[PDB]
């Protein structure tokens, strides 16, 4: 690794990495915020969509973030740009790619 990279062109993958949704956060609540962006990818056996909350290791309560697994990476890139600090539940999320 170093300074200068070979991969100049930018790997928007489908898969986004979003913090500070709040300790109060479930799945279908994040889902039914970046609905208006795109199709999330959903779990069927579950019956869920594809996003995994980072509970705390000490406290065991939410740390507000969530990987969110979008069908389309335009899609996935867009909630990125769109929701990048805007207001969750009254708390400003930080919206990145999951890599």
């Known amino acids: 690794m170093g300074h200068h990279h070979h991969h100049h062109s930018h790997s928007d993958n489908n898969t ?4 500070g949704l709040g ?3 479930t799945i279908e609540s994040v889902a039914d915020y ?3 962006i795109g ?3 959903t779990n069927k ?3 869920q969509p ?3 909350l980072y509970t705390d290791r000490e406290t065991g309560k939410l740390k507000g973030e969530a990987t969110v697994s979008f069908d389309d990476p335009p899609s996935a890139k867009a909630a990125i740009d769109w929701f ?3 207001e969750f539940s009254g708390n400003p999320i930080k919206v990145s790619f999951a890599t």
């Open 34 to 36: 970046f609905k208006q």
């Open 16 to 19: 986004i990495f979003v913090q």
């Open 84 to 86: 990048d600090g805007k």
């Open 39 to 41: 199709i999330i990818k």
């Open 50 to 52: 594809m996003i995994n």
């Open 23 to 25: 300790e109060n956060v």
């Open 45 to 47: 056996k579950t019956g």
